[PDB]
Design a protein around this ligand. Structure first.
Ligand code: CTP
Ligand code: MG
Length: 431
RNA sequence: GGCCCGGGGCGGUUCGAUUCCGCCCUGGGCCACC
């Protein structure tokens, strides 16, 4: 360990050239903003020197009086953001902000209400400046520890808190370091975390609760780890146990033949198909929760129709989106048996038998049963039907897109699509 | 936009639904975009 972590610092700590570049960009931002005479404050990992090597992104916050309208914040904010960046892009889900570059560095110009007491927030990001003040004096000296933690989560796919990841936010990493004292202590204790572990940083306590909860020092009602999924919490805990057991530098390093994949699927004997549709032109933060719903809704449909679904997944390229499925049943019989009433109450038995049927119901164990016919005998046939009539329940945007067009890609043609990596992961193909 | 909790109308399926699949309207929270 001791040694491994030393080498690890070389992958997480920014070199003197990247730091300079960030400082050079910092000064430029101040000079441009001072010329406008705007009120701003630097926050985030850049401000606390906790940003991960190769992930430099400066956060500048524009402070506005709380009396201001949210519309005003949006208009003035974007006005200032655009006038201060070399080039910019504007694309958000709810809270507005401008993304750009200043002297080769990524920058986020974010508008927010300058308040006192983060109790009742007015804009989604009002806590941020307060997180900064709380951390400034506590994280000073332990920033390399935060970086190891970030580099660890990043190299293993659970670093972002955004929906595409559902992992650990940067701020959460910093609270953990403040709570445990170091990357190693965090990892040692995380091995004992549970799905009901509550970490109260301000109280310096860990208690049992109703769900994994990391209390914000700035607001006790805020769960800093709110969007961390159970499975990612589990992957982290399991990763911590492995790292302690066999301390490797590979834990900080970021981690196939389409013809091989065909052989594998052939050997598994499963039904592997995908629902393909055009990708809605919307933010990742809106797209993903929809693909998750769409993916889940179809998966549940496949389970109640007895196709015995194994797993589902999804891929979103720039063109299309794909919802992936694997089922144990490639084809089921046309008939099935519907349970009827007990022979005892004749009223319902009469109604049951009056039903026009093709085979005539029988008695088994004191109750009537009837052979009914399915409307589809293959997983693909059912999904084609489901997705055509229930598109409205597949997410607001993903559902409307599927309404205007979708297709079921199966067999040979499916391995030609940009989903091969996703399938391998989904099927547990190893090597 | 997604999730959670709660109201008020419906339709389909079923011998049988409040409870299965869905659809309108609506109240309150929460999360992602910093
Ligand atoms: N889900 C989020 C996202 C952001 N923030 C706040 O916004 C700040 C800036 O977050 P961001 O710029 O997204 O990342 P950093 O925290 O700066 O860390 P890094 O850029 O390395 O990801 C955080 O410090 C935190 O106070 C938060 O509380 N919760
Ligand atoms: Mg940043």
């Amino acid at each position: 360990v001791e040694e491994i972590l030393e080498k690890a610092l070389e992958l997480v700590i920014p070199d003197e050239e990247e730091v300079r570049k960030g400082r050079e960009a910092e000064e430029e931002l101040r000079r441009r903003l001072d010329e406008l005479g705007v009120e701003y404050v630097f926050v985030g990992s850049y401000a606390r020197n906790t940003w991960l090597k190769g992930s430099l992104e400066i956060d500048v916050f524009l402070l506005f009086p709380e009396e201001f309208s949210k519309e005003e914040l949006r208009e003035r904010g974007l006005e200032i953001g655009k006038a201060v960046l070399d080039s910019y892009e504007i694309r958000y889900a709810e809270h507005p902000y401008v993304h750009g570059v200043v002297k080769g560095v990524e920058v986020d110009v974010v508008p927010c209400y300058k308040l006192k007491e983060p109790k009742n927030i007015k804009s989604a990001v009002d806590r941020t400046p307060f997180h900064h003040k709380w951390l400034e004096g506590r994280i000073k000296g332990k920033e390399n520890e935060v970086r190891l933690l970030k580099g660890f989560l990043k190299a293993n796919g659970i670093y972002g808190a955004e929906y595409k990841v559902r992992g650990f936010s940067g701020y959460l990493c910093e609270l953990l370091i403040v709570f445990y004292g170091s990357f190693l202590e965090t990892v040692k204790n995380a091995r004992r975390w549970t799905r009901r572990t509550v970490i109260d940083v301000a109280k310096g306590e860990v208690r049992k609760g109703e769900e994994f909860f990391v209390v914000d020092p700035v607001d006790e009602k805020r769960n800093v780890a709110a969007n961390l999924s159970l499975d990612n919490l589990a992957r982290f805990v399991h990763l911590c146990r492995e790292f302690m057991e066999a301390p490797s530098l590979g834990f900080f390093k970021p981690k196939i033949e389409p013809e091989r994949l065909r052989k594998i699927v052939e050997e598994r004997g499963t039904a592997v198909f995908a629902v393909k549709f055009r990708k809605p032109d919307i933010v990742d933060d809106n797209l993903y929760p929809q693909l998750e719903r769409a993916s889940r809704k179809i998966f549940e449909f496949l389970e109640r129709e007895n196709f015995m679904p194994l797993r589902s997944a999804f891929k979103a390229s720039e063109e299309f989106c794909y919802l992936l499925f694997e089922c144990q049943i490639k084809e089921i019989s046309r008939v099935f048996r519907r349970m009827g009433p007990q022979f005892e109450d004749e009223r319902n038995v009469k109604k049951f038998l009056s039903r026009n049927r093709a085979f005539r119901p029988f008695i088994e164990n004191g109750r009537w049963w009837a052979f009914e016919m399915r409307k589809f005998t293959t997983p693909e046939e059912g999904v084609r039907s489901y997705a055509s009539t229930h598109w409205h329940t597949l997410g607001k945007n993903v559902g409307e897109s599927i309404r205007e067009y979708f297709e079921i890609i199966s067999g040979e043609k499916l391995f030609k699509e940009p989903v091969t990596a996703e399938l391998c992961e989904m099927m547990g193909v190893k090597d």
